[PDB]
From a paper:
The Munc13–1/α-RIM interaction is particularly interesting in this regard since its physiological importance has been demonstrated and both Munc13–1 and α-RIMs are involved in priming and plasticity. Our results suggest that a Munc13–1 homodimer–Munc13–1/α-RIM heterodimer switch regulates neurotransmitter release and some forms of presynaptic plasticity, and reveal the structural basis for homo- and heterodimerization. 2A domain can in fact establish two different types of interactions that lead to either homodimerization with itself or heterodimerization with the RIM2α ZF domain.
2A-domain homodimer at 1.44 Å resolution, designed a mutation that disrupts homodimerization, and solved the X-ray crystal structure at 1.78 Å resolution of a Munc13–1 fragment bearing this mutation bound to the RIM2α ZF domain. The X-ray structure of the Munc13–1/RIM2α heterodimer described here provides the first high-resolution view of a complex directly involving a member from the family of ZF domains that includes α-RIMs and other Rab effectors. 2A domain and the C-terminal α-helix exhibit an overt shape complementarity. 2A domain and C-terminal α-helix packs well against the ZF domain. 2A domain arising from the expression vector used also extends across to make contacts with strand 3 of the ZF-domain, but otherwise is not well packed against it. 82–142 observed in the crystals is consistent with all available data obtained in solution, whereas that involving monomer B is not. Thus, NMR studies showed that a long α-helix (helix a1) and an SGAWFY motif at the end of the short α-helix at the C-terminus of the RIM2α ZF domain (helix a2) bind to Rab3A, and that the interaction involving the SGAWFY motif is released upon binding of Munc13–1 to the ZF domain. 2A domain would have steric clashes with Rab3A upon binding to RIM2α.
Author numbering:
A (entry chain C): 89 to 142
B (entry chain A): -8 to 154
C (entry chain B): 0 to 155
Write the structure that this text describes.
């Protein structure tokens, strides 16, 4: 049972979840988001790192 | 240019296991619910009686909408457990929402309908019912200012790491 | 809903070193989007089937292949498949190898093609499932929509 490293509740199916591009914590859809740069680059950032940089 | 839009992939399945109503003597039941989806399994605690209330939420981050959520209600035994009943909910029938719902009462069936070794429904209705909610959530949106901040911050770090 | 579009994302073949690739495929039709998980190597195999409810046929299926990075994931290639071109069949197929292009072409903030071929290819099966019948009322609606794609409901 891999589980979101933020909420510790959501369980990931194999290969699901995203790693935070900053802290590398694997997170579920409730716990971080995506920043898309032009049409060819995307990064992922968890809500804890978001909070820190606010 | 730079977007914080989360887009529209439905990956987070939320399931609310509410309660059940069994036909028969209450001392006969000490039951739990198991949920299975995309080879992930979760379970409530066991609750006694003919009207158990679990009120437990479960979340699964998945990517295969082509399957279903198997729900099983099990009567706990000290040596073996015995299935009270089951339903199978195709993931394509599950609403997309941001809110918890009231659930619906579903009749529990006794047996899976199997085709080609995979479950595709259930059969042989019992007189028991379960109250269950399920919904998919959409990904979060990051506001544009905050997205631009993160893109620049981590572009600079990427540029530094590459050097 | 005129038809259910089935899309089988089978595998891909990348030019260059195995260890450079850890890739996933995303699909978009109208505002419905889907994704595979990431698989390592120069010839990853996803073998994942997707389905979309299609009501208009003048648009396309956008397919993107992304490569995971520590910070950024990078889009390694894309194709845009006009829906009107997809085979009409209930039968799954072996897929066709399609060369991945470097970027989308836009008309009015919206994809209308791709350009700049890469040396990477994707194996995709796509087909429209046959509807069971088309009620007289809906046939009139589809006849109008198809007749501006130089198309018309099969008389049978
Ligand atoms: Zn989470
Ligand atoms: Zn983080």
């Amino acid at each position: 049972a891999p589980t979101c490293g933020i909420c510790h509740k959501t369980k990931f199916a194999d290969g699901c979840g995203h790693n935070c591009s900053y802290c590398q914590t694997k997170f579920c859809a409730r716990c971080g988001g995506r920043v898309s740069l032009r049409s060819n680059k995307v990064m992922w950032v968890c809500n804890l790192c978001r909070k820190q940089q606010e | 240019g730079i977007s914080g839009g989360g887009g529209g992939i439905l990956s987070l399945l939320c399931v609310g296991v509410k309660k059940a109503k069994f036909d028969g003597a209450q001392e006969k039941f000490n039951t739990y619910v198991t949920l299975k989806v995309q080879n992930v399994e979760s379970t409530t605690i066991a609750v006694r009686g003919s009207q158990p209330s679990w009120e437990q939420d479960f979340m699964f981050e998945i990517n295969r909408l082509d399957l279903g959520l198997t729900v099983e209600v099990w009567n706990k035994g000290l040596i073996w457990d015995t299935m009270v009943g089951t339903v199978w909910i195709p993931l394509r029938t599950i609403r997309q929402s941001n809110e918890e719902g009231p659930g619906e009462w579903l009749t529990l069936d006794s047996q899976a309908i199997m085709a080609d070794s995979e479950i595709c429904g259930t059969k042989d209705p019992t007189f028991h019912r379960i109250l269950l909610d399920a919904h998919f959530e959409l990904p979060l949106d990051i506001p544009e200012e905050e997205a631009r901040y993160w893109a620049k911050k981590l572009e600079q770090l990427n540029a530094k790491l590459n050097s």
